[PDB]
Design a protein around this nucleic acid. Structure first.
Lengths: 169, 159, 58, 222, 292
RNA sequence: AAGCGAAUGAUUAGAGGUUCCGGGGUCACCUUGACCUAUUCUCAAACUUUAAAUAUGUAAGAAGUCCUUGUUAC
RNA sequence: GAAAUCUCCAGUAGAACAAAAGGGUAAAAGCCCCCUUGAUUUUGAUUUUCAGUGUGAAUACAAACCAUGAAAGUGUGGCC
RNA sequence: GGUUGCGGCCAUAUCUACCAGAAAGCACCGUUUCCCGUCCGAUCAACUGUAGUUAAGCUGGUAAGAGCCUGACCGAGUAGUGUAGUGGGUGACCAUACGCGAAACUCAGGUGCUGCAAUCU
């Protein structure tokens, strides 16, 4: 066929939407750093609601993105939380897919006291070679309709990979 | 109270034409303006530095000064019972070459050509522009063109 | 009490009575407002041209 | 506070003054219903069309529009049935009329400053009409022409100015005359759209035209 | 998705060269504009473009009709002067900047003076005007859309032009080896970059580390069997040659343009005329409505 | 003036298309809560693509055109 | 969860630009970041209000000294 | 004639779907010691044109395609309008005379051209 058109991981984004800020976020920051090997960034709330205890610039969430083999290894190391078995949904109309989990500290690293226990959201970014064409500074362009990723294309890659299956309901 | 600000009643004068918004096409910055050139001021609303007053929109005048990014234009303004010499310091994108001037130039070159040609042969070349003279006589034949008659139409409401 | 506030009636008829005249421009218009760097040199150009002409004119 | 006579607002003396974000406290129109009768009829059911057309340039109050609407509808419905016709009010009262309210009590000169600050408050709505502009349109079958004539010649009494009833040559509310409409509808060029019809365009994507007017292309292959 | 007619009707397309993304028109305004008291003097631009596997340098002056080129140096022309591989590295970008710089100086007849730097120690030295002589030719670096960064190839071509006797305005904030703890550019480090010093040590490091990468990459160096310590010699052999004959000898240009036009013509698609378009719609209507 | 099957604001009517951000009737069940698509009627001083008539600026030369070389610290 | 954070797609601007409205703006005049103080000096010229007076505001410069940028340039307060 | 770098006019160039592309280039693409930047070499910076690919970008073709452009003795001399009348009409407004003259609509065609330089079976 064509080795270039082959579908591949682009990045995995790993966010925790927290109500508050403080030592909880310090611990939640340094659980992500030890998870992915790189520090996350604290995304800030752009609006106040008085119902979530959120102010602007409060840094009420931490998310990190990982790409490459480290992203590769972390992906299956989260899907085995639910055993490489997923939903017909969670697959976007673009191909990007994601799931959610609730623990990492004693999952794949050595536990220590004063770490906290946090839930968090996986999200997989999934595209094909030629993704600089939409991101390069000069001659920035758009991927073609034949090159666009879609739901039924990532699920097939999800079948050929991880020996996984969909729709466990 | 009544407002007579610098940009009153310019809601449309300082528009940008439909699908002509955004950056100014660069040839205006590459035009060359010499003192004495006759230019006309179509204000461009995209850039607001060195803007002409709304009176000078569509006004034509000679260029008296040429500056780093601007030109000095002399416009004549009717102030009561007489005209005044107004001197404007306008950015180069608010002005453009009047093409009325160059049309006169091309005729001037033509007249010199017609004179130099008239030197050898063809005296009385009539350099003067004649007004549109009434058409001279002619013969209108009727082949394939027998005049078809025409009568006023009856009135129908049509609606 | 109240009266007319503003009126342009007869203003144009008045303006033309003594005519509307152009400012009757001149050869060599005034060099005021033109760039000081340009004028600072135009002097020296005229100074040289006069000295050259006088040298030619003996 | 009572309504002023319509003679005071008959003529188009002012520029259009609609409800807008300048004009927030306008009263609602008295006419709310513009289509009456069997308004879901296909266009083939009602070939005849008769119009009530203004011959003057004036303003028709919303109350006049409502009152004539009631009059025409009641007469036609009683004579030929509710579903034998489709009556459409073509004109909409967007022009806001303004009123300067004068106190009519003794000693009013003390409480009211006459013409100072006389910008009238919004009073009602009117429709600006021009010469030759259609006021009402009625589509029905050729049968009930006299009945709708009387219904339309009974709505006129409720309209200021002089209006005329003219039967139209166009098929229903379409823009095209009877014979060439029949030309198209015979050649499958016409599709019903509830109260009006869609016409086949000689322009556009051939697949969409084919999907939407299959009968035309079938008749072309026969 | 399936944009409304209204949107595509009110759509103002940008300039064509912004639609394709190649030209930044916000900067080009303030590059090609001229002090209006300099009526017709061209404002020459040093356009340096870094495509994959080639470098483009060209002195460009803007006219009403468009842009005219004085002399263009590319990096597929260095092989004439000794540099064979690495036609994109920092040192090669310096080489092609020197190439265009000397090319213009010999084009405009200023080559006899404005030798730039004879010995090249890689220091920040502008071309000072020679007294009682024509001023140095002044060109402005139009990088394009390339991001400015400390120690980049696009500023390598700047330093090559500055060393070529051509007066490019610049400072050391972008030259490799710039210090943040002081206002002192590192002379040795930048001289290394002129002569492949950032490449030679990498070559040697991979030589003494492994062999697969030293073979998969750098095989061109291994194909002609040259050392990383020999990079300075071949680069100096380039620099001296460019100073000698920058006259821009073109290629042989075989298979002349008549054949070039004919060959490309036979393979490029043609736009169907009106009648055959009507034929392909009158047939299409019968095929898509043929009892379908 | 024209125009809203063009933007913004309004507006009348019918037609065709649903997510677990509610079927209100059998857990995905024929099942009325929408918006979108295509039409349709009527509009706008503080809406507009387009756009008059009238009124309006300049030019129609000897203080100009062309050829040659002279000054400048620009 | 309608609405907390993230990702992708469509997005001619339907946002933001301190505050009224109107105009202007898309590798920006918007958002985020780095560096600063030109929101400086000497006066003059000019446009608007106009008596072609003032005040106010603004425009282009010159001579300086600076800022910033890699530079072109931009900057004599706030996009107008 | 194709391509690239810089462009001019800035949709006849845009948009949507499909398809094609011989060589050359472009691009995607390959790797993190140094320059450099981010949370992430994705962007950006550096390095080799080396493993390849036209999949995509890009170029060109197709669409009774939308859009855009031009034209029409197409609407329509229509609406509107300047001037005039001791013209009409209670008026609102209308017609006439001398002039100017649309817009939507209908239809037809078209769907980038070009400048500099370099390069290409």
């Amino acid at each position: 066929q064509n080795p270039m058109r082959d579908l591949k991981i682009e990045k995995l984004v790993l966010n925790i939407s927290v109500g508050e800020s403080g030592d909880r976020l310090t611990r939640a920051s340094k659980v992500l750093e030890q998870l992915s090997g790189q520090t996350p960034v604290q995304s800030k709330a752009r609006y106040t609601v008085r119902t979530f205890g959120i102010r602007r610039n409060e840094k009420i969430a931490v998310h990190v993105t990982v790409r490459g083999p480290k992203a590769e290894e972390i992906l299956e190391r989260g899907l085995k939380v639910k055993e490489y078995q997923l939903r017909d949904r969670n697959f976007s109309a673009t191909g990007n897919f994601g799931f959610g989990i609730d623990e990492h500290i004693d999952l794949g690293i050595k536990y220590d006291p004063s770490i906290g226990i946090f839930g968090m959201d996986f999200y997989v970014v999934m595209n094909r070679p030629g993704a600089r064409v939409t991101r390069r500074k000069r001659c920035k362009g758009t991927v073609g309709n034949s090159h666009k990723t879609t739901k039924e294309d990532t699920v097939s890659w999800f079948k050929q990979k991880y020996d996984a299956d969909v729709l466990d309901k | 109270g009544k407002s007579h600000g610098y940009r009153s009643r310019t809601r449309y004068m300082f528009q940008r034409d439909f699908r002509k918004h955004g950056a100014v096409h660069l040839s205006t910055y590459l035009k060359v303006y010499k003192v004495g050139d006759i230019v006309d001021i179509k204000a461009n609303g995209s850039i607001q530095k060195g803007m002409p007053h709304k009176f000078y929109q569509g006004k034509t005048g000679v260029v008296y000064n040429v500056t780093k990014s601007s030109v000095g234009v002399i416009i004549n303004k009717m102030v009561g019972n007489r005209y005044l010499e107004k001197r404007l310091n306008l950015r180069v994108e608010h002005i453009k070459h009047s093409k009325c001037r160059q049309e006169f130039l091309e005729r001037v070159k033509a007249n010199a050509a017609k004179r130099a040609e008239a030197k050898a042969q063809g005296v009385a070349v009539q350099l003067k522009r004649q007004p549109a003279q009434p058409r001279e006589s002619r013969i209108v034949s009727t082949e394939g063109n027998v005049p078809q008659t025409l009568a006023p139409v009856p009135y129908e409401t049509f609606i | 009490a109240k009266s007319k506030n503003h009126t342009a009636h007869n203003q144009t008829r008045k303006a033309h009575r003594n005519g509307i005249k152009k400012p009757k421009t001149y050869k060599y218009p005034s060099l005021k407002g033109v760039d000081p760097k340009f004028r600072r040199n135009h002097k020296h150009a005229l100074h040289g041209t006069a000295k050259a002409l006088a040298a030619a004119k003996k | 506070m009572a309504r002023r006579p319509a003679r005071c607002y008959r003529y188009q003396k002012n520029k259009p003054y609609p409800k807008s974000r300048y004009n927030r406290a306008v009263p609602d129109s008295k006419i709310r219903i513009y289509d009456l009768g069997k308004k879901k009829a296909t266009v083939d059911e009602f070939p005849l069309c008769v119009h009530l057309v203004s011959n003057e340039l004036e303003q028709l109050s919303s109350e006049a529009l409502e009152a004539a609407r009631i009059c025409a509808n009641k007469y036609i419905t009683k004579t030929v049935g509710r579903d034998a016709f489709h009556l459409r009010v073509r004109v909409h009262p967007f022009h806001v009329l303004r009123i300067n309210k004068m106190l009519s009590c003794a000693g009013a000169d003390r409480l009211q400053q006459g013409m100072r600050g006389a910008w009238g408050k919004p009073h009602g709505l009117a429709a600006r009409v021009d010469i030759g502009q259609i006021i009402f349109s009625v589509r029905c079958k050729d049968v009930n022409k006299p009945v709708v004539i009387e219904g339309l010649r009974r709505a006129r009494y409720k309209f200021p100015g002089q209006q005329k009833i003219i039967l139209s040559k166009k098929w229903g509310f379409t823009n095209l005359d009877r014979p060439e409409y029949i030309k198209k509808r015979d050649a499958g060029e016409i599709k019903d759209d509830g109260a009006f019809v869609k016409f086949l365009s000689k322009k556009g994507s051939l697949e969409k035209n084919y999907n939407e007017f299959p009968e035309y292309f079938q008749n072309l292959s026969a | 998705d399936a944009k409304s007619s209204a949107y595509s009707s009110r759509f103002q397309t940008p300039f064509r060269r912004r639609r394709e993304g190649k030209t930044d028109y916000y900067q080009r305004k303030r590059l090609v504009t001229q002090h209006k008291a300099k009526y017709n003097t061209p404002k020459y631009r040093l356009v340096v473009r870094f495509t994959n596997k080639d470098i483009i340098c060209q002195i460009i002056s803007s006219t009403i009709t468009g842009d005219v080129v004085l002399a263009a140096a590319y990096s597929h022309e260095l092989p004439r002067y000794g540099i064979t591989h690495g036609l994109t590295n920092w040192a090669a970008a310096y080489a092609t900047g020197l190439l265009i710089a000397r090319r213009t100086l010999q084009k405009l007849g200023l080559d006899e003076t404005y030798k730039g730097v004879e010995e090249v120690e890689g220091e920040y030295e502008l071309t000072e005007a020679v007294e009682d002589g024509p001023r140095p030719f002044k060109v402005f670096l139009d990088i394009g859309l390339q991001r400015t960064t400390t120690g980049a190839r696009v500023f390598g071509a700047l330093k090559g032009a500055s060393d070529g006797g051509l007066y490019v305005p610049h400072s050391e904030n972008r030259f490799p080896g710039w210090d943040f703890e002081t206002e002192e550019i590192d002379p040795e480090l930048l001289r290394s970059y002129i002569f492949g010093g950032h490449v030679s040590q990498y070559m040697e490091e991979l030589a003494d580390d492994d062999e697969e990468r030293f073979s998969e990459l750098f095989k061109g160096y291994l194909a002609d069997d040259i050392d990383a310590d020999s990079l300075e010699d071949i680069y100096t052999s380039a620099h001296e040659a460019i100073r000698a004959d920058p006259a821009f000898k073109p290629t042989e240009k075989k298979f002349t343009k008549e054949q070039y036009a004919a060959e490309s013509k036979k393979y490029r698609q043609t736009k169907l005329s009106k009648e055959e378009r009507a034929a392909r719609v009158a047939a299409k209507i019968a095929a898509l409505a043929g009892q379908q």
